[PDB]
Amino acid sequence: FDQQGVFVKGYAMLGVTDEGESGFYRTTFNCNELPTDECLWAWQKNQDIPQLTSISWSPSSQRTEWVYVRLGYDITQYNFFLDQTEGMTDAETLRQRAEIRFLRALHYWYFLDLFGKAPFKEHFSNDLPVEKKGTELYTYIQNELNEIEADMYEPRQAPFGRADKAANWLLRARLYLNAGVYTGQTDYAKAEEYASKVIGSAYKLCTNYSELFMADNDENENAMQEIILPIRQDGVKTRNYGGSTYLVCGTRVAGMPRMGTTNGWSCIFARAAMVQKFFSNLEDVPMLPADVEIPTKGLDTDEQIDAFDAEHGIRTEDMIKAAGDDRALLYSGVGGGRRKIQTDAISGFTDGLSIVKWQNYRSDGKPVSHATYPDTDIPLFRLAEAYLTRAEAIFRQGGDATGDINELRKRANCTRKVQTVTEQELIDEWAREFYLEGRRRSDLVRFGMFTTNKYLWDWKGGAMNGTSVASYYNKYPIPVSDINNNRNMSQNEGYK
Ligand SMILES: [Ca+2]
């Protein structure tokens, strides 16, 4: 038993691994992004993509089984480390157990949030996991975090990459924020409290939003000060087709300026509703006029591409100025072809605006380690979450959440201030702040907008302009394979 090595692998499971399809981050990300208003997967021919895209999957869903099997696998590995260090009481080992138990709690949260239940197992053995659902599961996760807190590093006192007390508190805030959904009983007071504990910690907001998703976010202090839990990635050493490689390569295509990589998969683009988050009137979106032809030559270098885009006011920096928000990191320029905002039929990558939020360029201008894979870390946990969580919690309780909302909009140099917080403004702010970070679905569900008519976005439910689906889709089904293999599990309501 190599305690040190197993400990390290526990964290590694977040960012390393069809293999490229079944990783931790990619599977959770897809279940929380592909069916939402933020994006679309360009190749609908890919297995189960249509299902996830329009919220029409079933118990035989391959992508549901992927995330399900992956989450459980990671936990079995955490259970192994825990059984091997059980009873030990030295300071460092306790700290290691707390961090591993934090990672397991995080995994159980995914189960709870995605399936509303989980195949529960506390130790590493061969027995069949037993089902732990709803309130029972919720309380288990909360208890774990409450117990391990004292054994963890103080905020920002842990080696970059490892989880500290704040990471602990932020997850608890998120759980409390969703208590109504998971236990049927809201607990917004607690959500506010723990959110305040994180805001009261050493962590601080990065003064430049984009820098949070750049190649040097693990060395740039301005970004690190806000990154509570990073999933380390590295162009040469830590590679994963489903890691940051997914977020950068998947969102680019040959022809785009400053791709940051040699391989543009042209897979992920934004839905019209995502663009609308920055432009209430989609007519305000900078776009190349229909009657202006795109040259077939002379648009090779970034300087040539930028020159054309600038002439027509369609460089990403032009998109940002038009949106009056630093977060509007979208591309409607010509590199890659004439783009559409909304499409009458999902036919390709250009049927929507490109998202260039993630970049494989360092804020300090220095070279990155590789030409194809990004160095960019995935800031899974960010301080900003605390502000949005406290803002929502305060709002729900009848208080005034304008101060917390403004803190984020001020950071993004927004020209439009939110005077009166409303449910609509809140869910739209979650989108603007965290889009393409793998959490959208969870928030939509909390707001009662994921499956209902309360909120319709393009291509929801499979309809061009969107439509509602059965309410039982607010939870993914337990893979039919686990049902037949583990008599202890029972399918979720609504499915067959
Ligand atoms: Ca890195």
Swiss-Prot record:
<feature type="binding site">
    <location>
        <position position="375"/>
    </location>
    <ligand>
        <name>Ca(2+)</name>
    </ligand>
</feature>
<keyword id="KW-0106">Calcium</keyword>
<comment type="function">
    <text>Major starch-binding protein present at the surface of the cell. Mediates starch-binding before starch transport in the periplasm for degradation.</text>
</comment>
<dbReference type="GO" id="GO:0005983">
    <property type="term" value="P:starch catabolic process"/>
</dbReference>
<dbReference type="GO" id="GO:0009279">
    <property type="term" value="C:cell outer membrane"/>
</dbReference>
<dbReference type="InterPro" id="IPR011990">
    <property type="entry name" value="TPR-like_helical_dom_sf"/>
</dbReference>
<feature type="binding site">
    <location>
        <begin position="18"/>
        <end position="20"/>
    </location>
    <ligand>
        <name>D-glucose</name>
    </ligand>
</feature>
<feature type="binding site">
    <location>
        <position position="377"/>
    </location>
    <ligand>
        <name>Ca(2+)</name>
    </ligand>
</feature>
<keyword id="KW-0449">Lipoprotein</keyword>
<keyword id="KW-0732">Signal</keyword>
<feature type="binding site">
    <location>
        <position position="26"/>
    </location>
    <ligand>
        <name>D-glucose</name>
    </ligand>
</feature>
<keyword id="KW-0998">Cell outer membrane</keyword>
<feature type="binding site">
    <location>
        <position position="218"/>
    </location>
    <ligand>
        <name>Ca(2+)</name>
    </ligand>
</feature>
<keyword id="KW-0564">Palmitate</keyword>
<feature type="binding site">
    <location>
        <begin position="43"/>
        <end position="46"/>
    </location>
    <ligand>
        <name>D-glucose</name>
    </ligand>
</feature>
<keyword id="KW-0479">Metal-binding</keyword>
<keyword id="KW-0119">Carbohydrate metabolism</keyword>
<dbReference type="GO" id="GO:0019867">
    <property type="term" value="C:outer membrane"/>
</dbReference>
<dbReference type="GO" id="GO:2001070">
    <property type="term" value="F:starch binding"/>
</dbReference>
<dbReference type="GO" id="GO:0005509">
    <property type="term" value="F:calcium ion binding"/>
</dbReference>
<feature type="binding site">
    <location>
        <position position="233"/>
    </location>
    <ligand>
        <name>Ca(2+)</name>
    </ligand>
</feature>
<feature type="binding site">
    <location>
        <position position="241"/>
    </location>
    <ligand>
        <name>D-glucose</name>
    </ligand>
</feature>
<comment type="pathway">
    <text>Glycan degradation; starch degradation.</text>
</comment>
<feature type="binding site">
    <location>
        <position position="265"/>
    </location>
    <ligand>
        <name>D-glucose</name>
    </ligand>
</feature>
<dbReference type="GO" id="GO:0042802">
    <property type="term" value="F:identical protein binding"/>
</dbReference>
<dbReference type="GO" id="GO:0005982">
    <property type="term" value="P:starch metabolic process"/>
</dbReference>
<keyword id="KW-0472">Membrane</keyword>
<comment type="similarity">
    <text>Belongs to the SusD family.</text>
</comment>
<comment type="subunit">
    <text>Interacts with SusC.</text>
</comment>
<dbReference type="Pfam" id="PF07980">
    <property type="entry name" value="SusD_RagB"/>
</dbReference>
<dbReference type="InterPro" id="IPR012944">
    <property type="entry name" value="SusD_RagB_dom"/>
</dbReference>
<protein>
    <recommendedName>
        <fullName>Starch-binding protein SusD</fullName>
    </recommendedName>
</protein>
